[PDB]
Ligand binder design. Structure first.
Ligand SMILES: Nc1ncnc2c1ncn2[C@@H]1O[C@H](COP(=O)(O)OP(=O)(O)NP(=O)(O)O)[C@@H](O)[C@H]1O
Ligand SMILES: Nc1ncnc2c1ncn2[C@@H]1O[C@H](COP(=O)(O)OP(=O)(O)NP(=O)(O)O)[C@@H](O)[C@H]1O
Ligand SMILES: C[C@@H](CN1CC(=O)NC(=O)C1)N1CC(=O)NC(=O)C1
Ligand SMILES: [Mg+2]
Ligand SMILES: [Mg+2]
Lengths: 382, 378
């Protein structure tokens, strides 16, 4: 039947039917993932089985909180509470909350608009060059859509009110907001959600997902300047990106060479054991598939090393490198909503990052150089 | 606050933020293969092209190839590129689009599936399908990025012909012209004029024309039992081995290419790479230029065995001497994005397996790859 064969569906129906291009796979995946080990106080690489979409909806909320540091530089604190037994996750940030006002076009409260309707954002005017992670106006709604319960709480000092709004059943139930007088306290936003574990094929939050979620909170402390992050009330202790990269020290002439190149670029280098490795952040987004920023940095290092060597194949140099990058890119573009891979051309970054000769010279003091010299005179022998 | 926060439509968002739908609408400097007509072979060239423009064309091509999955009686695809008039025509035979009013939507079906987002015949995954179409965007994405978009189709069930024109990024939809058709065969024809200025272009230059043309050779290579015509010329690629062999001259510049059909859903070819790892792969006729799980599945098998042989050197040394070609069929595939450049489907969900025979890996151990690896080892 022609009418049965050709189907039209709503955008909301499509998201639930086909999560992949919105939040990534809802099937279990075997992955090698970095985990923060509390018994040894360091990052360890572990074979885990996780559902990427579940990890992603958490990440969407985390990155929104980090984005608030950009809009409000006075923001000091992010709290992440994971209540595994209760299947609830809370992310709270201080600094400016959400305006408690009726939108003069949409005729609803702004928090209801931007957490309860697709395609809503403060990031749609690209005349402003912004270094927020937020771009498309989907993130928070995707979390809501994949939650059985989703609660937004915010306090607005301009009106002196607190606003609490609950959605249920994959954003399909939207309860009216509870608005109360709020005097003589700080602004903040708190997002609480209970992921719809049925849609992720799970019955509980297991040790693998909790492990990667917790590490992602370390990432946030590592990548966002001048904030204090707490996990279930406990300080993560690290204060900057250098401290973050140092958590990898045990698993990795200094082992780690770190440099802030400018106010938008920090780079660290270590020698890799097996092959090319990268850990990179764009506006606090974890770019696990790398992209133009990673290639920009590594190409430079490879080119400069190669030139010193010729005075070997490029993949030979590259694959002895473990690179860490924390960068701020203007109005970035990615291959997908998950933002695993940056596609912004270098000329559109809004900044440059030239790696200085002094840094390259320091790399030439590491095992990387020894390994390349071996390849080199073997190539001469033949 | 009201000005700080905005709600936009799906259609506004696509034009505002094309990247997750069709890829970048900015120029990209790329190494790309093109078919050199004078030498009758593939040549690697530095080009500057806008991926989104290449992609809207690819959406229409793969749709035509999908019609061969749906109707195995289909025999030909015609592509006509009219560079001067920036017009592109893609015609296939076999079953057309049903000229019926939809039960629910109350409009003609072709209007529905070419002129409204989120419309598809691929939404029911109870059926295990080997089409490339998955999400119900591709054809609409082409329409949206066109100044003018024309669907022509004829169905023999009703004995009619249906012609409908959209304009101005799909915003103008003209009523269909439906006429009596007792004439020849069923067919569908899509004619569009890309909104070139939206891609920052004045005209279809030689770079984009070269990759568009190569992509048509790709289709002939990856899809069996069809004739493919480009601007009137029969391409006549016999099979996937013939397609791979188009790369022979540039690679040759112990056979140069080792080809094997593994089974009915998997074909692989191998050549030695001079600079780094290279792959050309297709999943259900989609060009998976960013690879993914199928490429990893094949290369891991090869690298793992060669590693054991050398052990009797790091895995990256082996992999970076490989040029792999893969043509495969995957059930209900999943990708990272609408552009379908990277497959994410797990091997266990493929619908088939591809165990590379040890004698094939033995043939690989006769090439320059082994000589190079043994010099690192010994
Ligand atoms: N913790 C927060 N504090 C302040 N504003 C927030 C917070 N979380 C979300 N927002 C606002 O809500 C809007 C919607 O969030 P979101 O759905 O994630 O879209 P986005 O961040 O703009 N883009 P994207 O994440 O790429 O889909 C954002 O644009 C912010 O303006
Ligand atoms: N040349 C064609 N012949 C027959 N049917 C077609 C043709 N092109 C498109 N269709 C039909 O039109 C629908 C819409 O096409 P399209 O927008 O490209 O979606 P899709 O191919 O199903 N999914 P996707 O391409 O992944 O976004 C398809 O599902 C097909 O049923
Ligand atoms: C790519 C688009 C959604 N996508 C669904 C799909 O399967 N194909 C499309 O073209 C549209 N995306 C949704 C989202 O979460 N964020 C965006 O920016 C647009
Ligand atoms: Mg966001
Ligand atoms: Mg399609």
């Amino acid at each position: 039947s022609a009418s049965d064969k050709y189907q039209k569906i709503s955008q909301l129906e499509h998201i639930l039917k086909r999560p992949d291009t919105y939040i990534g796979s809802v099937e279990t995946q075997e992955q090698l993932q970095w985990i923060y080990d509390e018994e040894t106080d360091c990052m360890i690489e572990k074979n885990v089985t996780i559902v990427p979409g579940l990890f992603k909806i958490f990440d969407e909320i985390l990155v929104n909180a980090a984005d608030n540091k950009v809009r409000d530089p006075s923001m000091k604190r992010i709290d992440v509470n994971i209540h595994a037994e209760e299947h609830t996750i809370e992310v709270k940030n201080d600094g400016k909350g959400i305006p408690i006002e009726i939108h003069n076009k949409e005729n609803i409260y702004i928090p209801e608009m931007i957490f309860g309707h697709l395609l809503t954002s403060s990031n749609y005017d690209d005349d402003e060059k912004k270094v927020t992670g937020g771009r498309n106006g989907y993130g928070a709604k995707l979390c809501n859509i994949f939650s059985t319960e989703f609660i937004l709480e915010t306090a607005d000092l301009n009106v002196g009110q607190k606003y609490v709004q609950k959605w249920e059943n994959n954003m399909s139930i939207c309860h009216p907001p509870k608005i109360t007088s709020y005097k003589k306290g700080p602004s903040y936003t708190k997002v609480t959600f209970k992921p719809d574990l049925t849609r992720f094929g799970m019955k509980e939050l297991d040790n693998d997902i909790l492990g990667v979620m917790r590490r992602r909170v370390y990432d946030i402390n590592g990548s966002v300047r001048d904030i204090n992050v707490y996990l279930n009330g406990k300080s993560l202790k690290i204060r900057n990106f250098k401290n973050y990269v140092e958590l990898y020290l045990k698993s990795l002439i200094p082992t780690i060479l770190y440099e802030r190149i400018n106010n938008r670029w920090e780079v660290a280098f270590a020698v890799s054991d097996i092959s090319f490795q990268q850990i990179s952040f764009v506006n606090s987004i974890a770019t696990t598939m790398g992209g133009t920023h990673v290639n920009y940095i590594t190409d430079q290092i490879v080119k400069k090393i190669s030139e010193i060597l010729k005075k070997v194949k490029s993949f030979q140099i590259k694959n002895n490198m473990f690179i860490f990058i924390n960068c701020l890119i203007e109005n970035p573009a990615f291959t997908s909503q998950t933002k695993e891979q940056l596609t912004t051309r270098v000329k559109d970054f809004g900044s440059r990052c030239e790696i200085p000769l002094e840094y390259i010279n320091k790399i030439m003091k590491t095992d990387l150089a020894t390994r390349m010299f071996e390849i080199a005179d073997a190539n001469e022998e033949n």
